[model samples]
Target: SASDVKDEWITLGTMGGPIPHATHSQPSNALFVNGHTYIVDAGDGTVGQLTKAGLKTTDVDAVFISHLHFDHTGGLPALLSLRWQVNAGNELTVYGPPGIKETVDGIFAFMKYGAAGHYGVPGQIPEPANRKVNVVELTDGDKVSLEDFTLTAVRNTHFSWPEGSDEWKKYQALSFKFELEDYTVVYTGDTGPSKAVELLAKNADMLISEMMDVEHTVNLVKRAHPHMPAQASKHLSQHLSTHHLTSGEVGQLAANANVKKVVITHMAPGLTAPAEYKKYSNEIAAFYQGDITLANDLDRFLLQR
Candidate 1:
């Protein structure tokens, strides 16, 4: 049955966050492979985006989170709750970096209050969310093998604390590589220029990368928060520049990795004009000669053998 299913990749939400865009949703993507749907990054509008893609919450077999940032995981609670409420027969698994289990536990605790408050139904039975959902905490070099694919995790350059420091030991951000029967896809959730990511993505069929224009994003932040202190603004600018991938950096990664195609998502301060989108592609084209796509919300790319 799995062999008969056609695989496809869907960019459900393309806009980077914590800033919301009028036209685009936040960061989320879906991979339909071997009759199973796997979600990557369940950002704020992920549920609605999945619906727009003609998929139900119960259709998700698993979710892989790149990190614990609110912009990357905001929709997870709703997804878990909805599946439980509907009495979906299948169990769902959420895989992420360390602390993921605790995060899911906290969400289940928060949902308990509302589950107890609904008193109108005569024959209502609220199942425990923890029982319906499972969480796995992954780290660098972890591999998860499924029936038709294998997913690998690697630490990326999103966090820049000294090695062996408390912060570095306590927190981690990751990139993921999914290897299927006929295709290999890599999702670089959020990172600057990570050699580990480049190596993990080598010779893959597609590299789905997050792109940011540091200067433009910094200016947007300053204009949105004019009253902020100068020192705080400087710190924010430094963080954005070092922790996220610029357009050229993304292209460099793709080129170095020799991926067959590139799908750009997680656009910072989403562009309104077609020309703006073209600008990013052109920059990427300068470094890499592969196929490049500036993905929008709900865009689909089918995987072929």
Candidate 2:
């Protein structure tokens, strides 16, 4: 019974940036249920974190990528290559936006020499036809039933400004609603303020979202590197404000969805220092009445009915 299953959500990396930092890794997460693992977003150093968590690369049954942004997909080539090392016959499905197949195709070409060189025995490596990785591109309202969960992809405005338009949406970004038998969890994968999230995450058991500190980030960048001209700073601030959610926004979204718990990940800037989170907490609490968590790398949460 699903009631007898304990689903684990592991935050492999908590930072959200194109470049990796000492304080935090990039964005990656794992959902483990009944001995099967689903990886969400494979950023830099994701495999290392998986090993750090005492799991094998072979354990991942599938991967769900929110977008094609480098910070979210930088580690995919590595993960795929390493998985081939230990388990040549293992098949894993990768679900993402339109460019997923192209990205993996590039990875296959990029790793051809290494993959070909590392064959330990005669004909040990699987044929290209049996390479064991499948890519499925998803559109909004698409439903895919996996082994233990039903996933619905909801279109989000990250790279694309307006939905159903061709300007930036030749390829698009997504947030996901994962409905498990016992509990429902929603992941707002690097989305801006979204009506889609508000609707899809409604009454969910947990909302794991990317939270930004636009005010603090603007201030910090302006103060630390004053050379950035006023107009450039303005553009940066405007872009971030449009593409991400502030603490107050996080509170409002979670409250609007009426979710049971809010676990904030993909934090912005270096603003997550000790006293900073208290400020975020206070702001969110002013708008939301439920439990709020400032998530960290390697942090684990359980989903239950």
Candidate 3:
């Protein structure tokens, strides 16, 4: 059955950054399973990447949104509105963490409110489609089986809903484990290191998780958020180690999990260029003696049993 038409799959884009770069693309990952396409996260500037890789919106059966951060789901509204003009015809379903219904409604309401005024004017924006959206929200330990893949959601401890409050909410920040065929591919949304991923990603084939260089993120968290890092006062050299995974740990996690290979994605400022990422790969390979993917836009790493 796996070979019925499994051509395995291919990745469209895999880079995480505040701004889209020239050499690489944004944090969008698509898996083309034979004729069907399942999208992981639709980061900003993904449409162009999709076309560049010869994929049509109509090809997308479902989209798994990691979280609601703009960089993570920035291209969503545009995708829904433009689907009509593209080859897509069937209704699109989106699944993400809790509060997605409210988040989806809010985003659509904002879009219609703007489009009505702009398109209503003369020679203005073209009228968009009467788009349809289905948002399914879930927390940890839930599984949905698509014909082609099985999706499982797991909560990440990096960010909590209503943020920074111990008050437990129905739905909050999350990660996901995608079990397809005989391989389990984990997408760590935008997490810092947490038990959530470790528990869910046990023995997965590919772990597409985020990583920020400890030193690089020190000034970012300390200054950008206009607050102190959660563990800023812990130790000057070991500050960022608390929240996120670094190059060394990325490899260790893969080896420890017994996964055959590891994919380093959701990469950030530390691995700016290919040259810089190469060393991180080397550092990871030092501990984990398996294949390591220094992924880039359109890089393909086909996995099988």
Each candidate: RMSD: 2.2, 2.8, 4.6
Say which candidate scores most in TM-score. Answer: 1
How many clashes does the backbone of model 2 have? 0
Best by lDDT: 1
User: Residue 172 lDDT in model 1?
Assistant: 95
Pairs of colliding residues, candidate 3: none
Write down the lDDT of every candidate, Cα atoms only: 0.88, 0.85, 0.69
**What is the alpha-carbon lDDT for the whole of candidate 1?**
0.88
lDDT of 2 by residue, 181-243 (tens): 889999999988889889999999999989888866787778778898999889988988878
lDDT of 1 by residue, 1-305 (tens): 54556788999999886888888898899899877888999998788999999788888989999999998999888888877776788888999999898999989997887766645587877656576688899998999999868999998999998988988867899999999998899999999898999999999999999999887888788899889898988898889878898889988999999999999899897988989978889999999999999899999987864
Clashing pairs in 1: none
List the candidate numbers ranked by TM-score, top first.
1, 2, 3
Reference-based TM-score, model 2: 0.91
TM-scores, one per candidate: 0.95, 0.91, 0.81
Q: Which one wins by TM-score: 1 or 3?
A: 1
User: Which stretches of model 3 miss by more than 4 angstroms?
Assistant: 1-10, 85-87, 113-130, 160-167, 218-240, 270-275
